[PDB]
Design a protein around this ligand. Structure first.
Ligand SMILES: *[C@@H]1O[C@H](CO)[C@@H](O[C@@H]2O[C@H](CO)[C@@H](O[C@H]3O[C@H](CO[C@@H]4O[C@H](CO)[C@H](O)[C@H]4O)[C@@H](O)[C@H](O[C@H]4O[C@H](CO)[C@@H](O)[C@H](O)[C@@H]4O)[C@@H]3O[C@H]3O[C@H](CO)[C@@H](O)[C@H](O)[C@@H]3O)[C@H](O)[C@H]2NC(C)=O)[C@H](O[C@@H]2O[C@@H](C)[C@@H](O)[C@@H](O)[C@@H]2O)[C@H]1NC(C)=O
Ligand SMILES: *[C@@H]1O[C@H](CO)[C@@H](O[C@@H]2O[C@H](CO)[C@@H](O[C@H]3O[C@H](CO)[C@@H](O)[C@H](O[C@@H]4O[C@H](CO)[C@@H](O)[C@H](O)[C@@H]4O)[C@@H]3O[C@H]3O[C@H](CO)[C@@H](O)[C@H](O)[C@@H]3O)[C@H](O)[C@H]2NC(C)=O)[C@H](O[C@@H]2O[C@@H](C)[C@@H](O)[C@@H](O)[C@@H]2O)[C@H]1NC(C)=O
Ligand SMILES: *[C@@H]1O[C@H](CO)[C@@H](O[C@@H]2O[C@H](CO)[C@@H](O[C@@H]3O[C@H](CO)[C@@H](O)[C@H](O)[C@@H]3O[C@H]3O[C@H](CO)[C@@H](O)[C@H](O)[C@@H]3O)[C@H](O)[C@H]2NC(C)=O)[C@H](O[C@@H]2O[C@@H](C)[C@@H](O)[C@@H](O)[C@@H]2O)[C@H]1NC(C)=O
Ligand code: HEM
Ligand SMILES: *[C@@H]1O[C@H](CO)[C@@H](O[C@@H]2O[C@H](CO)[C@@H](O)[C@H](O)[C@H]2NC(C)=O)[C@H](O[C@@H]2O[C@@H](C)[C@@H](O)[C@@H](O)[C@@H]2O)[C@H]1NC(C)=O
Ligand SMILES: *[C@@H]1O[C@H](CO)[C@@H](O[C@@H]2O[C@H](CO)[C@@H](O)[C@H](O)[C@H]2NC(C)=O)[C@H](O[C@@H]2O[C@@H](C)[C@@H](O)[C@@H](O)[C@@H]2O)[C@H]1NC(C)=O
Ligand SMILES: *[C@@H]1O[C@H](CO)[C@@H](O[C@@H]2O[C@H](CO)[C@@H](O)[C@H](O)[C@H]2NC(C)=O)[C@H](O)[C@H]1NC(C)=O
Ligand SMILES: *[C@@H]1O[C@H](CO)[C@@H](O)[C@H](O)[C@H]1NC(C)=O
Ligand SMILES: *[C@@H]1O[C@H](CO)[C@@H](O)[C@H](O)[C@H]1NC(C)=O
Ligand SMILES: *[C@H]1O[C@H](CO)[C@@H](O)[C@H](O)[C@H]1NC(C)=O
Ligand SMILES: [Ca+2]
Ligand SMILES: [Ca+2]
Length: 304
């Protein structure tokens, strides 16, 4: 199975090299932190954590990158490229893109919230990437509680782990189109989702047009309280009708989920520890190991 310090011998500085690339990119643009954490999530939820999400589309293959949930919202690809460049120079053909992405998400959590943990490694890189699979496997923000739980259960994660991992929305942004469903033509008198603060809704409407699509270059911070700190304020917001996504608000529509939200909002240390543990578990979903797959030399294309 995956082991912490898989590269102890084959590439002693692998993890430091990645961290330095992530740190440099984060200083340039703090948005790479949520970008990379989300990217690792999207890796792990399609064919497991095998770097499939990193592959560029080609003439004969439309890759995950071009899926609805991924294009153009995914970001941080250049950081992975930069990290891979450094690692290949230091230890040729040794460190997988899948491991680099897992390392980078951990480094991002540390930079954005001082949340740190050790990452089991030894993942191998897959050779398949399909927009169709990402389209089907990535959860929708329109999902209700039951749908979110079921989605995550199919990926080995418990309902509580789903609530914990949703706390990643304590940083980063969402395109208007991901929540305009709550702002316009909702089944209500105002046309607005009643579970969203009317005052928050008013301001969101002034920022996001009803005709927004995933390509409309307008985004809004997921956490209105501390938009750039990976803390537990996401939960505080969710309890106050300030959760931004339908799937965020979903977390207070069922007893057990609501209790978890309450617990996380009350105790940063407790949530942060659970988040670290859940990230580690997520990063082991359907991984390729041993001689399975390959060590991809260029994270954007399968080896030839
Ligand atoms: C890459 O390199 C790193 C760094 O070396 C490896 O990580 C380290 O791995 C070692 C084990 O190889 C591990 O050592 C201790 O494990 C537990 C820790 O225990 C908790 O803390 C308390 C301690 O009282 C409690 O016991 C535990 O709940 C210890 O139990 C264990 O010690 C006992 O075992 C030793 C040796 O077998 C004996 O004395 C006796 O049987 C004891 O019962 C290990 O102990 C410690 O021994 C050292 C002796 O020199 C001592 O100096 C030091 O205190 C040391 O901790 C380290 O904790 C761990 N380091 C970190 C930071 O995590 C890594 O290994 C992989 O990942 C780790 C986490 C394990 O899962 C390994 O199995 C795994 O291989 C290396 N990676 C690879 C792939 O090789
Ligand atoms: C890591 O992996 C990624 C993904 O593969 C790679 O990025 C790709 O690089 C290729 C070039 O190697 C690039 O291809 C096109 O650039 C232009 C796009 O319009 C185009 O002019 C050019 O057309 C040509 O090549 C053939 C033969 O030489 C001829 O038709 C022309 O003379 C022309 O030169 C490139 O090609 C199209 O060619 C393919 C033919 O099979 C065709 O099937 C593809 O559609 C291709 O577009 C490609 O666009 C690019 N992919 C993406 C998504 O960006 C990395 O390459 C590096 O970064 C790239 C952005 C480029 O700057 C490239 O020069 C860099 O080397 C690669 N990293 C490294 C270090 O190799
Ligand atoms: C500090 O952060 C900013 C924000 O990320 C960096 O600026 C960006 O740099 C990227 C290139 O690495 C620019 O992307 C290109 O845009 C071109 C014109 O549209 C495209 O043709 C080209 O493909 C790039 O685009 C898309 O490319 C990827 C596909 O391969 C996509 O995954 C991704 O979505 C991307 O948009 C980007 O436009 C630019 N952003 C801004 C707001 O300027 C910045 O990078 C450096 O500085 C910028 C201004 C450029 O000069 C880069 O060449 C340079 O590397 C970064 N500082 C750094 C890393 O030094
Ligand atoms: C539980 C079900 C989830 C749903 C329905 C969901 C949905 C979404 C949506 C729609 C966005 C905005 C995308 C956009 O419009 O640009 C988003 C952003 C984000 N998500 Fe999730 N997500 C879920 C879980 C997770 C998990 C498990 C993680 C990581 C552990 C995560 C990390 C992130 C991050 C960091 C952002 C901001 C990204 C950025 O700013 O680049 N999400 N999510
Ligand atoms: C959350 O979304 C689910 C859809 O994936 C809803 O469940 C499904 O509801 C459909 C209603 O038309 C029904 O056809 C499906 O058979 C059912 N699938 C299952 C069992 O997951 C769910 O709706 C509630 O529960 C289902 C079983 C029915 O009783 C619906 O009438 C209920 O509304 C959604 N949850 C809520 C609270 O709406
Ligand atoms: C998407 O919704 C936008 C908000 O209503 C549209 O823009 C607005 O269009 C009004 C006329 O329809 C115009 O008086 C407003 O000034 C304008 N507001 C802004 C902020 O642009 C938009 O319509 C398109 O873009 C505007 C500027 C005009 O060129 C229209 O003719 C366009 O249709 C809507 N876009 C689409 C694709 O329908
Ligand atoms: C907030 O959460 C932290 C982390 O769980 C709690 O700290 C620990 O307390 C529990 C009590 O059950 C112990 O079992 C752990 O061993 C402690 N570990 C750590 C990380 O300190 C803390 O008690 C919680 N705060 C409050 C007020 O409930
Ligand atoms: C971050 O975490 C460490 C413990 O791991 C702690 O010593 C430090 O004071 C914390 N503060 C920050 C955000 O740097
Ligand atoms: C989940 O994945 C699919 C159902 O969507 C099915 O093939 C598999 O048996 C399910 N079980 C898991 C992996 O929990
Ligand atoms: C929490 O909710 C689940 C599903 O509604 C229920 O089965 C369970 O009994 C509740 N709490 C626990 C873990 O007992
Ligand atoms: Ca994958
Ligand atoms: Ca926050």
């Amino acid at each position: 199975d995956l082991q912490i310090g898989f590269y102890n011998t084959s590439c002693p500085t692998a993890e430091s090299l990645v961290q330095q690339a992530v740190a440099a990119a984060f200083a340039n643009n703090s948005g790479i932190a949520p970008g990379l954490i989300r990217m690792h999530f999207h890796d792990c939820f399609v064919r497991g954590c095998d770097a499939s999400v990193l592959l560029d589309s080609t003439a004969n293959n439309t890759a995950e990158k071009d899926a609805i949930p991924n294009n153009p919202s995914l970001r941080g690809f250049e950081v992975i490229t930069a990290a891979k460049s450094a690692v290949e120079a230091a230890c040729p053909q040794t460190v997988s893109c899948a491991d680099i992405l897992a390392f980078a998400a951990r480094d991002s959590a540390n930079l954005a919230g001082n949340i740190t943990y050790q990452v089991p490694s030894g993942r191998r890189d897959g050779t398949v990437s399909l927009a169709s699979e990402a389209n089907a496997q990535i959860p929708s923000p329109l999902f209700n509680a039951t749908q979110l739980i079921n989605s995550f259960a199919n990926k080995t994660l418990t309902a509580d782990e789903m609530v914990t991992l949703s706390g990643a929305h304590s940083i980063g942004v969402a395109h208007c189109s991901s929540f305009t469903n709550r702002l316009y033509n909702f089944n209500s008198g105002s046309g607005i989702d009643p579970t969203l603060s009317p005052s928050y809704a008013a301001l969101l409407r002034n920022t996001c047009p009803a005709n927004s699509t995933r390509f409309t270059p307008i985004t809004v911070s997921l956490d209105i309280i501390t938009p750039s700190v990976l803390d537990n304020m996401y939960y505080t917001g969710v309890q106050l009708t300030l959760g931004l996504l339908t799937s965020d608000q979903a977390l207070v529509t069922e007893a057990n989920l609501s209790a978890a939200v309450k617990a996380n909002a009350m105790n940063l240390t407790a949530w942060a520890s659970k988040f670290a543990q859940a990230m580690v578990k997520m990063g082991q979903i359907e991984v390729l190991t041993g001689t399975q797959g390959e060590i991809r030399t260029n994270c954007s294309v399968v080896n030839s």
